[PDB]
Design a protein around this motif. Structure first.
Motif, PDB file in Angstrom:
ATOM      1  N   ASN A 139       0.621  -1.320   0.123  1.00  0.00           N
ATOM      2  CA  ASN A 139       0.032  -0.078  -0.027  1.00  0.00           C
ATOM      3  C   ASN A 139       0.908   1.275   0.196  1.00  0.00           C
ATOM      4  O   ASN A 139       1.675   1.286   0.976  1.00  0.00           O
ATOM      5  N   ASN A 156      -2.285   5.882  -1.487  1.00  0.00           N
ATOM      6  CA  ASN A 156      -3.431   5.152  -1.004  1.00  0.00           C
ATOM      7  C   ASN A 156      -4.076   4.036  -1.795  1.00  0.00           C
ATOM      8  O   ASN A 156      -4.800   3.535  -1.536  1.00  0.00           O
ATOM      9  N   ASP A 157      -3.277   4.006  -3.178  1.00  0.00           N
ATOM     10  CA  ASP A 157      -3.392   2.836  -3.648  1.00  0.00           C
ATOM     11  C   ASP A 157      -2.617   1.646  -3.513  1.00  0.00           C
ATOM     12  O   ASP A 157      -1.473   1.908  -2.985  1.00  0.00           O
ATOM     13  N   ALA A 158      -2.999   0.279  -3.694  1.00  0.00           N
ATOM     14  CA  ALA A 158      -2.254  -0.725  -3.494  1.00  0.00           C
ATOM     15  C   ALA A 158      -1.939  -1.464  -4.720  1.00  0.00           C
ATOM     16  O   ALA A 158      -2.849  -1.502  -5.635  1.00  0.00           O
ATOM     17  N   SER A 182      -7.433  -3.682  -6.716  1.00  0.00           N
ATOM     18  CA  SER A 182      -7.961  -2.779  -5.550  1.00  0.00           C
ATOM     19  C   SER A 182      -9.359  -2.441  -6.136  1.00  0.00           C
ATOM     20  O   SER A 182      -9.871  -2.561  -7.218  1.00  0.00           O
TER      21      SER A 182
HETATM   22  C1  LIG Z   1      -4.172   1.484   1.699  1.00  0.00           C
HETATM   23  O1  LIG Z   1      -4.506   2.084   2.953  1.00  0.00           O
HETATM   24  C2  LIG Z   1      -5.764   3.073   3.312  1.00  0.00           C
HETATM   25  C3  LIG Z   1      -5.866   3.344   4.545  1.00  0.00           C
HETATM   26  O2  LIG Z   1      -6.816   4.240   4.975  1.00  0.00           O
HETATM   27  C4  LIG Z   1      -6.789   2.233   2.878  1.00  0.00           C
HETATM   28  O3  LIG Z   1      -7.877   3.065   2.987  1.00  0.00           O
HETATM   29  C5  LIG Z   1      -6.692   1.936   1.546  1.00  0.00           C
HETATM   30  O4  LIG Z   1      -7.673   1.224   0.845  1.00  0.00           O
HETATM   31  C6  LIG Z   1      -5.666   1.004   1.083  1.00  0.00           C
HETATM   32  N1  LIG Z   1      -5.501   0.561  -0.323  1.00  0.00           N
HETATM   33  C7  LIG Z   1      -5.877  -0.517  -0.787  1.00  0.00           C
HETATM   34  C8  LIG Z   1      -6.558  -1.594  -0.067  1.00  0.00           C
HETATM   35  O5  LIG Z   1      -5.861  -0.769  -2.091  1.00  0.00           O
END
Ligand SMILES: *[C@@H]1O[C@H](CO)[C@@H](O)[C@H](O)[C@H]1NC(C)=O
Ligand SMILES: CC(=O)N[C@H]1[C@H](O[C@H]2[C@@H](O)[C@@H](CO)O[C@@H](O[C@H]3[C@H](O)[C@@H](O)[C@H](O)O[C@@H]3CO)[C@@H]2O)O[C@H](CO)[C@@H](O)[C@@H]1O[C@@H]1O[C@H](CO)[C@H](O)[C@H](O[C@]2(C(=O)O)C[C@H](O)[C@@H](NC(C)=O)[C@H]([C@H](O)[C@H](O)CO)O2)[C@H]1O
Ligand SMILES: CC(=O)N[C@H]1[C@H](O[C@H]2[C@@H](O)[C@@H](CO)O[C@@H](O[C@H]3[C@H](O)[C@@H](O)[C@H](O)O[C@@H]3CO)[C@@H]2O)O[C@H](CO)[C@@H](O)[C@@H]1O[C@@H]1O[C@H](CO)[C@H](O)[C@H](O[C@]2(C(=O)O)C[C@H](O)[C@@H](NC(C)=O)[C@H]([C@H](O)[C@H](O)CO)O2)[C@H]1O
Ligand SMILES: CC(=O)N[C@H]1[C@H](O[C@@H]2[C@@H](O)[C@H](O)O[C@H](CO)[C@@H]2O)O[C@H](CO)[C@@H](O)[C@@H]1O[C@@H]1O[C@H](CO)[C@H](O)[C@H](O[C@]2(C(=O)O)C[C@H](O)[C@@H](NC(C)=O)[C@H]([C@H](O)[C@H](O)CO)O2)[C@H]1O
Ligand SMILES: *[C@@H]1O[C@H](CO)[C@@H](O[C@@H]2O[C@H](CO)[C@@H](O)[C@H](O)[C@H]2NC(C)=O)[C@H](O)[C@H]1NC(C)=O
Ligand SMILES: *[C@@H]1O[C@H](CO)[C@@H](O)[C@H](O)[C@H]1NC(C)=O
Lengths: 322, 174, 174, 174, 322, 322
Positions: E166, E237-239, F218
Motif C-alpha cells: 500500500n 493510498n492505492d495498493a 484494488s
Molecule cells: C491503503 O490504506 C488505506 C488506509 O486508509 C486504505 O483506505 C486503502 O484502501 C488501502 N488501499 C488499498 C487496500 O488498495
C-alpha cells in the motif's frame, strides 16, 4: 528654341502584376515565380529508378502472391509506386504485422536480393505440397504464396519442428513467416493432427509466441480461415530459431537488404517515362528552380514550397500605358 | 508612384524607345531621335535582376518525402500531419503573396525614382540656361548641337559657354 | 540611389567628419572645417537603433525540449517530426534572409532621404543669395562669417540682410 | 519621414482643415480658406484601403479541429503537437508584428510623399510668377482671384494669363 | 566666394551587407543578429542541474545495473543527459515495457527518492540470494540488478506468492517488476519447480497477467534467456497486488516521484561546466538575446529560432566609400 | 502678393501606432486587425449543433451508463463537448479499447441511430437478469450498462454461445462488447460454472480471442472485478460472429453510423447559446474576417491565425499633430 525630353520605355505588352496598394497594373516586363508545369511522367529520382508495383501491394510482392508478376531483380530503388487500391495484396485473407512501418522501411533501398534460406527439402517429416488454396489461384489451379510454405501433417502426424538459420551473409535479412488460424476443431486436426499448437520464434531481440485463434469468421476470397504474417530483420551473424507443432507458415526465401536513405510510398497510376528528376509528384516530375509551386502536395525530393496560388508575378519592367 | 515621375509631370511613355528603359528625346535643327541612358538603365536592370534572384535563391530546399503512411486506426496522428501541412501552406502562401505585393510596389517606385533622378541630372546642368516646360521637357535659351545634345546625356555640359548667349533671349524676349 | 543623394548629386563621403552621420563643410574667409547637424543625425541613430531592437524584441520565444524520442518501429512519426523541424527551418531561414535584404535596402535609402532633406533645407534658406554648384555645395554670393555659417546650420538664416548684397554680385558681374 | 513633407518644411497639422487629407491654404484679397485636392486624397484613400484589404484577404484559412486527443501513454506525440502549435504561434506572431511595423512606415512615407507631390505640382504650376517662402507656401507676383486659384487647384494655369503681368509686380519690389 | 556643402560620414570600414537589389555593399556600421557562439559546456537549466548518466541508460539506472551508480545524489533534475549508445543498459538481455514514454516522463523530475517497499525478508519460502548472472558482472562475480530480486525455488518448492504493498506515502510511486523467460523445460523446473507459471499484477488501474515464453533464443551477453520488465505509477493510498508461482522478478526498491514539468533526453558527450543557462544545446549552452542562431537544432529551453545561415548582418550606418 | 499653401489633415485623435523606427506615434485614423472578442457561448458549427455530453463521458454514453442521462436521440452533430473531468464514465470499473481513436471518429457524425441487433430472447439457456452491480445503481437498485447484457450461468450451467448477426442495414454498425475479469476461481465458477473460458469475435476483418485475467485488484466503485470493452465497425452485408463459454458481456444495441467529415472533442463548461458560427473556442465563438486573433488556441472551424499579441494596429491616416 531647342527641346530636350526625359522619358521611359513602353511596349506592346498586356502583362499584369499586383501591388500592395494598386490592383491590376500593366507592366512592360514581368516574371512569375510560381511553378505550375510538370512532365506528366514518373521519373528516376537522382538517377535511381522507382520500384513500380503494377497492381500488387508490398505485402503481395514480398510474400509472392501468385497473381502478382514473378519477382524481377530490382536491386535498388528510390521510391515505391502503388496504385490507390492494389488488387493483389493478400490472396489468402489475414494480415501482415507492422505493415506500415515495413512499407516505410522498404520505400528506398540501396541493395535488395532474394535468397533461399530454407529449401522445401528441409522438411522431411512434414508435407510441403498440400499447402494450397483456391483463394490463391495460379493458372486457375489452387496455389499459395511463392516465398513461404504451408506445412501440413504427414502420415497423420505433425512432429514438433526445431530449426535454426544463421545469417552468414554480410547484409541484413528480411524474413517473413506466418501462422494459420483454422476454422474449427475438426479442421485443425485434419490439417495438423494436434488440437493445441503454438509457434515460437527467437533471435537476439525477438521473443515471439503465437497460438492459433480457432473461431468462426466471415468469408474473404471464399475462405473463413486467416493467416497472420510477421517479419523481422536478422542482423549478420545472428540466428533465428523456429519451433512449432502446427499452423506454421514457414519461410523459404528471405531478402538481403541494405538501407541508406529514406523515402515514402507514392500512390499514382501515371506511367514511367525513362526520365530523371530531383522532385517527383503523383501527377508528374518537376524541373524547376522556383521557390513555390501549386501542382501537388504529395511530393518526393527537393521541391519548391507548396502554396495555394494561381500566380505570383513579379514586376521587372516599367508601368506600360497604351 | 511616390517620386511623381511615371504619373507626375511626364504623362507619356515612348513606344519608339526600343534600346533602353530610360532615355532622352532631343529636338534641334539637325533632326530628332531617341537616345538611351545606358548608365541609368544598367543600374535598374541589375537591380531588378538581383531582386528576382534573391527571392529565388534565398529559399532553402531539403529532400522530403510526403505520403500517407498511417492506417485507419491512426487517424489522430494523420490529423496531426494534416494540421502541419495546412499550417505550412498557409504560412508559405500568405508570405509569398505579400512578398510579391510589397516588392512590386518597391519596383514600381524604383523606376519612378530613376526617371526623376535623370530629370534632375539634366536640370542641374542647364539651370537658368534653359527653361522648364512642365511636362518633363526643357526649352533651351540657345542653340544645341548634336554634340551638345550628347553632352547633356553624358553629364559633361558646359554652362559658361551658352550662359552669356542665354541672356540674349531671357531678358530681351519680353 | 532612390533619392539620388549618396551617389546622386553628392558623390563622395567625408572622412574628416568624425562627430556625426550627416553634416556640413564650410569654406569662408576665416577658413574651412566640418560640422554635423546634431538633430537630423540623432533622428537617424534612434531610428536604426529602434529598427534593430524591433527585429530583435518582437521575436516570441517559448520553452521547448527538442530530442529524438521515437524508436525504430516509430520511424513514421519520427519522419513526421523531421518534416516539421525542416519546415520551420525553411520558414525561418527564408524570412530572416529576406528581412535582412529588404530592411538593409530601406536602411540605405533612409540615409539618402535624410541627406537630400538636409540639402533642401539649406537650399530653401539661401534662395538666390547662393548658387547651387551641383555636387551638393552652395557658392555664396556674399560674405558669410562663421556665424552666418552657423545661422545656416541652426536654421536661422536672415535673407533680407544679404538680399541686396547678393544682387550686387549676381547681376553686376557680367 | 523620407521625402520630407509631414515633418519637413510644411511641418503643420492643419486642425482647421477637416474636409479631407491633402489640401491647400489660400490668402488672397477676397478672404482666406482651405480646399482639398479630390484626386490626390482619393488616390490615398483607395491606397490605404487596398493595403488594409490585401493584408486581410490574402490570408488562406482552412477548417481545422484543434484538440487534445492523446492519452498519458502518448505524451511524446502530444509534445510533438505542442512543438507544432508553438512553432506556428511564433511564426505568425513575428510576421504579424513586423508586417505592422514595416507597413506603417511605408504608410506614413506614403502620406509624406503625397504632400510633397502636391507642393511640387504647385511649384511647376506657378514658376517665376510666384516665390517660395519656405514653409510650403508661395508668394504670388500678381493678383490672384478666386477663379485663378481654381485654375491652379485643377492644374490648368497657362502663361497667357500671367506672363508679363507677374513680371511687373515682381520687379516693382526691388 | 564662400561655400557650404552637404555630405555624410565615412570611416575605415570594410564591412559588407547585402540588400534586395545589391550585394557586397560596404557600410560604416553594421550588426549581426545571428547567434553563433556557445560556451561549449552542459549547464544547469534555470537553476536546476541535469541528471548526467555517464555511460548508463535510463533503464540500467532505474533497475540498478551493477556497473551503474547505486545512490541517487540528485533529487531533482531539469533534463537527462545520455551518451549516444550507453554501454550499461540491460546487463541481462530483455526489454523494458513502454521505455520511451517512461524516459520522457523522467526527463524533468521535481522530486525523486528511492525507497524500499519489499525487503528481502518478505520472501521466507523462496531463495533470494541465487538470482545472479554472468551477464551482470560485478567485481569479477555474477550479480544482478540491485533494485529487483530474482526469486528462485527453495527446497525444490516455489510456493505461490501473494504479496501486496500500500502506498502510504504522499507521493506517487514508480514501481518496476519483471518476468523471466526460461530456455527449456529442464531449466524451468530447475529454477522454479513449477512447469506452468504465471504473474498477476493488480492495482486500481493495472490488470496484468503474464506467462513465460519458454523458447530457444540467440545468446545476448552470453545468455539465451530473457527478462521483460514493466512499470506502473502507484498513486497515494492505492495498493499493488502481486501473485506468481514462478519466473517472477520481484521489486525491492521503488521511487517516490513528483513531476511538475516536461523536458527531453539530450544525447551529448560534453562535460558538465558548473554554469547556468536558459537554453542548452548538445554542444554548449547559449547566452544571447538574438532572434536567430545556427548552432544546433536539438535545443532545450528558451532559444533563438534555428536557421541555416552563416550571417544575418543588418546595415545600421551609411554607405561607405574608400 | 497673394499666397497659396500646402498642408495635410490633423484632428483630435489620440490613436497610437508603432512603426519599425518610431514608437507611440499618434495618427488620425488607425485600424486594429487583431481579433479579441467572442460571444462567450457554445454555438452551432456551420448550421450543425454539437453533441453536448453534460457529465457523461463518451464511453458512458455509448454503453448506456445508468447514472448518466437516457439516450436523447441526437441524429447528427458537428463536434463533441465534454467536461474536463466527466463524473460518470464507467460505472463498473474497466476500460474501453482504442478509446481515443473511437472518440476521434465519433467527433463528427452525419447520421447516428441506436438499433437492437441481439434481443434478450436470444439467450434462452443463459440468465439475462442477474448481470447487475451496485457500482452501476439505478433508483437505488443494482443495475448495469443498458446497451449490453452481462450474461450469467443458468441451472448451474453455461452452454457455449455461438451467435452471428448479419448487418442487413445500408449503414455501418458500431458494435461494442466486453469481457469480465473475475476476482478468484470460486467467483468464476459461481458466475459462469466454467473454470477456463474464452471469447471469440470474428468478422471479415476482426479475428479476436480473449481470456479472463483472474487476479487480485484494488477496489474501484466498490468492485475488484474489471470489464474490458471493445468495438468494431461492421460493414453492410458483413456478419459478426460471437463465441464464448463465460465472462461475455454481449451486445444488445448497436449504432447505425454515417461519417462524412472530421472534428475533435472540445473540453469546456460553457453553455450552449442557440447561435451559429464558423469558428468555435472553449470560451466562445468568433465572428470575424480578421487574419489574426489571440482568444484561444483550441479552435474548431475556419479561424484566424492564433498569435500572442494584444494589438496589431495598422495606421491608415496621416501623422496627427495636436
Ligand atoms: C491503503 O490504506 C488505506 C488506509 O486508509 C486504505 O483506505 C486503502 O484502501 C488501502 N488501499 C488499498 C487496500 O488498495
Ligand atoms: C472438397 C470440397 O470442395 N468441399 C466442399 C463441400 O463439398 C461437399 C458437398 O458438395 C457435399 C454435398 O453433400 O458433397 C461432397 O462430395 C461427396 C459427394 O456428394 C458424393 O457423391 C461422393 O460420393 O462423396 C463426396 C465426398 O466424399 C463434397 O465434398 O461443400 C462445402 C459446402 O459448400 C464446401 O464448403 C467445401 O469446400 C471446402 O470447404 C472448406 C471449409 O472447411 C475449405 O474452405 C475448402 O477450401 C480450401 C481452400 O481452397 O482454401 C481447400 C484447400 O485444399 C485447403 N487447404 C489445406 C492445406 O487444407 C484449405 C484449408 O482447408 C482452409 O483454407 C483452412 O482454413 O481450404 C473448401 O474447398
Ligand atoms: C452478500 C454480501 O453481502 N456479501 C458481502 C459480504 O457479506 C458478509 C459480511 O457482511 C459478513 C460480516 O462478517 O457477514 C455476512 O453475513 C452473515 C453474518 O455474519 C451473520 O451476522 C448473519 O447471521 O449471517 C450472515 C450470512 O450471510 C455477509 O454475508 O461481505 C464481504 C466482505 O465485506 C463483501 O465483499 C460481500 O459483498 C460482495 O462481495 C463480492 C466480492 O466478494 C462482490 O463484490 C459483490 O458485489 C457485486 C456487485 O454489486 O458488483 C454483487 C452483484 O450481484 C454481482 N453480480 C453478478 C452478476 O454476479 C457482482 C459480481 O459478482 C462481481 O462484480 C464480479 O466481479 O458483485 C458484493 O456484494
Ligand atoms: C553452472 C555452469 O557454469 N555451467 C556451465 C557448464 O558447466 C561447467 C563445466 O563446463 C566446467 O567444466 O566445470 C564447471 C564446474 O567445475 C561447470 O560445471 O559448462 C558449460 C560449457 O559449455 C556451460 O554451458 C555452462 O554454463 C551455464 O549454462 C547454463 C545453461 O545454459 C546457463 O546459461 C548458465 O548461465 C547462468 C548465468 O550466469 O546467467 C548461471 C546462473 O547461475 C543462473 N542463475 C539462476 C538464478 O538460475 C542463470 C540462469 O540459469 C539462466 O540465466 C536462466 O535462463 O544462468 C551458464 O553458466
Ligand atoms: C449477409 O446476408 C446477405 C444477404 O442477406 C449475404 O449476401 C449474399 O451473399 C451471397 C454469398 O456470397 C452472395 O452470393 C449474394 O449475392 C449476396 N447477396 C446480397 C443481397 O448481398 C451476405 O453474404 C451475408 N453475410 C455473411 C457474412 O454471411
Ligand atoms: C552464427 O554463426 C557465427 C559464425 O559461425 C557465430 O559466431 C554466431 O554466434 C552464430 N549466431 C548464433 C545466434 O548462434
Amino acid at each position: 528654341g531647342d527641346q530636350i525630353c526625359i522619358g521611359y520605355h513602353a511596349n506592346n505588352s498586356t502583362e499584369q502584376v499586383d501591388t500592395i496598394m494598386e490592383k491590376n497594373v500593366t507592366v512592360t516586363h514581368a516574371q512569375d515565380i510560381l511553378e505550375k508545369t510538370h512532365n506528366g511522367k514518373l521519373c528516376d529520382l537522382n538517377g535511381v529508378k522507382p520500384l513500380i508495383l503494377k497492381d500488387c501491394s508490398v505485402a503481395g510482392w514480398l510474400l509472392g502472391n501468385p497473381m502478382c508478376d514473378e519477382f524481377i531483380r530490382v536491386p535498388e530503388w528510390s521510391y515505391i509506386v502503388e496504385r490507390a487500391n492494389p488488387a493483389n495484396d493478400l490472396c489468402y485473407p489475414g494480415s501482415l504485422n507492422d505493415y506500415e512501418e515495413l512499407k516505410h522501411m522498404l520505400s528506398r533501398i540501396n541493395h535488395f536480393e532474394k535468397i533461399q534460406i530454407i529449401p522445401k527439402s528441409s522438411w522431411p517429416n512434414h508435407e510441403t505440397s498440400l499447402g494450397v488454396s483456391a483463394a490463391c489461384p495460379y493458372q486457375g489451379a489452387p496455389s499459395f504464396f511463392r516465398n513461404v510454405v504451408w506445412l501440413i501433417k504427414k502420415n497423420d502426424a505433425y512432429p514438433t519442428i526445431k530449426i535454426s538459420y544463421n545469417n552468414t551473409n554480410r547484409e541484413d535479412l528480411l524474413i517473413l513467416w506466418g501462422i494459420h488460424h483454422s476454422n474449427n476443431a475438426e479442421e485443425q486436426t485434419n490439417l495438423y493432427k494436434n488440437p493445441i499448437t503454438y509457434i515460437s520464434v527467437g533471435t537476439s531481440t525477438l521473443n515471439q509466441r503465437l497460438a492459433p485463434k480457432i473461431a468462426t469468421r466471415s468469408q474473404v476470397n471464399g475462405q473463413r480461415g486467416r493467416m497472420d504474417f510477421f517479419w523481422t530483420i536478422l542482423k549478420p551473424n545472428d540466428a533465428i530459431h523456429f519451433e512449432s507443432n502446427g499452423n506454421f507458415i514457414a519461410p523459404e526465401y528471405a531478402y538481403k537488404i541494405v538501407k541508406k536513405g529514406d523515402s515514402t510510398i507514392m500512390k499514382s497510376g501515371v506511367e514511367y517515362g525513362h526520365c530523371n528528376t530531383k522532385c517527383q509528384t503523383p501527377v508528374g516530375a518537376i524541373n524547376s528552380s522556383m521557390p513555390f509551386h501549386n501542382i501537388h502536395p504529395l511530393t518526393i525530393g527537393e521541391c519548391p514550397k507548396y502554396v495555394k496560388s494561381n500566380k505570383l508575378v513579379l514586376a521587372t519592367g516599367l508601368r506600360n500605358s497604351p | 508612384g511616390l517620386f511623381g515621375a511615371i504619373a507626375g509631370f511626364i504623362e507619356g511613355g515612348w513606344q519608339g524607345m526600343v534600346d533602353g528603359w530610360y532615355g532622352y528625346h532631343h529636338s534641334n535643327e539637325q533632326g530628332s531621335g531617341y537616345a538611351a541612358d545606358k548608365e541609368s538603365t544598367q543600374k535598374a536592370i541589375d537591380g531588378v535582376t538581383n531582386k528576382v534572384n534573391s527571392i529565388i535563391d534565398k529559399m532553402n530546399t531539403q529532400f522530403e518525402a510526403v505520403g500517407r503512411e498511417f492506417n485507419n486506426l491512426e487517424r489522430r496522428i494523420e490529423n496531426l500531419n494534416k494540421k502541419m501541412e495546412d499550417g505550412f501552406l498557409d504560412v508559405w502562401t500568405y508570405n509569398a503573396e505579400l512578398l510579391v505585393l510589397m516588392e512590386n510596389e518597391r519596383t514600381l517606385d524604383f523606376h519612378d525614382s530613376n526617371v526623376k533622378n535623370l530629370y534632375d541630372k539634366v536640370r542641374l546642368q542647364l539651370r537658368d540656361n534653359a527653361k522648364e516646360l512642365g511636362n518633363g521637357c526643357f526649352e533651351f535659351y540657345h542653340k544645341c548641337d548634336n554634340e551638345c545634345m550628347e553632352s547633356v546625356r553624358n553629364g559633361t555640359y558646359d554652362y559658361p559657354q551658352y550662359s552669356e548667349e542665354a541672356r540674349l533671349k531671357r531678358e530681351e524676349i519680353s
